[PDB]
């Protein structure tokens, strides 16, 4: 496409460091555009992302690096009967009435435990000391991975992140950094060594762990889902489900710190925490551009005639800065009107864990502000954000008097 020749010079490092300048141009120039270093069409605006995610002429496809990382059948990459079965598999513990039965007793003692380790120090790096541990320990316990330490869960989602977003391709469309998948393979081998004996046990002795229910629910007597059939969805969880609520709470805190009067409002009135998080997710979307759909017939989207078989990456992080919808979207603003956003995606493959994730983030921020009402950002330290596929702050140094 001749007028987009500047896209040939966009690098993967640029998109990882900060994709918003490139995507601001894409939203204006070409809401559906082929990005050479990604080797794919990308949808950058809210209208195009929603249309593709809900269109009957598209179905899910995994990103190239995502497929190399997760294999088949990852819940994000399949359709039809297999997708219906995997949704029925994961949905029970995520049902809102079910989450409401136990979410407080799950997350609140976890939040307290991590807080107790540092709440009197006067300094902390909240990503590693709080946001990521609460996110992974909550979900890990729900899944049946109580004995997998939070350090290890955090290391796994970071390796799976890097592997599944190792998207750069060369002049020939081949992966430019094939090495980059080796740490995803290593994380999967470690996961197998830990989880295979738990599956061995759950097959014979089912319990209330989510993974035991994935093996047993809906199955004929004495049968279980084959472990090779469920492992790719286990990996999907050990990446995003483990990583995202922590990144969402952290981005929300960075946003609030950028608006000190709003931080004070939310600390004074914790009923505003859900609104603060919704704006945080729009402002820096944790799943920024990690999923995709593929056309199943020829289709015209945003003026582009696509053949059947065309993948389109859904860059929901960019769609959530669409200036067709939002005023000054790069600014965090608690008092933005509560409008629809795309940080949980859309359509048949939209996020299955929204209600759970929102409560995990809410309870974590409730307990943080409670414990440390005079929390302030350490302004001697910069907050970098990193990531094109998944995006979040790499640290969040804070301070408080005591
Ligand atoms: C703030 C935290 C989270 C955010 C921002 C988020 C966002 C998303 C997004 C954008 C997608 C892809 C949707 C699409 O392609 O249209 C997704 C898919 C998914 N998410 Fe969430 N997620 C979060 C937490 C979680 C958690 C904690 C769980 C599980 C407990 C979860 C389970 C899933 C599942 C199973 C899918 C795949 C749905 C499918 O393909 O049918 N998510 N999520
Ligand atoms: C819930 O985890 C994911 C969602 C979308 C893409 C990759 C994931 O691991």
From TrEMBL:
GO molecular function: heme binding; iron ion binding; monooxygenase activity; oxidoreductase activity, acting on paired donors, with incorporation or reduction of molecular oxygen
Residue numbers binding heme b: 83, 87, 291, 293, 316, 346, 349, 351
InterPro entries in UniProt: Cyt_P450, Cyt_P450_B, Cyt_P450_CS, Cyt_P450_sf
A Pfam family it matches: p450
PROSITE patterns (UniProt xref): CYTOCHROME_P450
Keywords assigned: Heme, Iron, Metal-binding, Monooxygenase, Oxidoreductase
Protein's UniProt keywords contain Metal-binding: yes
The family this protein is said to belong to: Belongs to the cytochrome P450 family.
Name of protein: Cytochrome P450
Provenance organism: Amycolatopsis methanolica 239
Lineage, broadest ranks: Bacteria, Bacillati, Actinomycetota, Actinomycetes, Pseudonocardiales
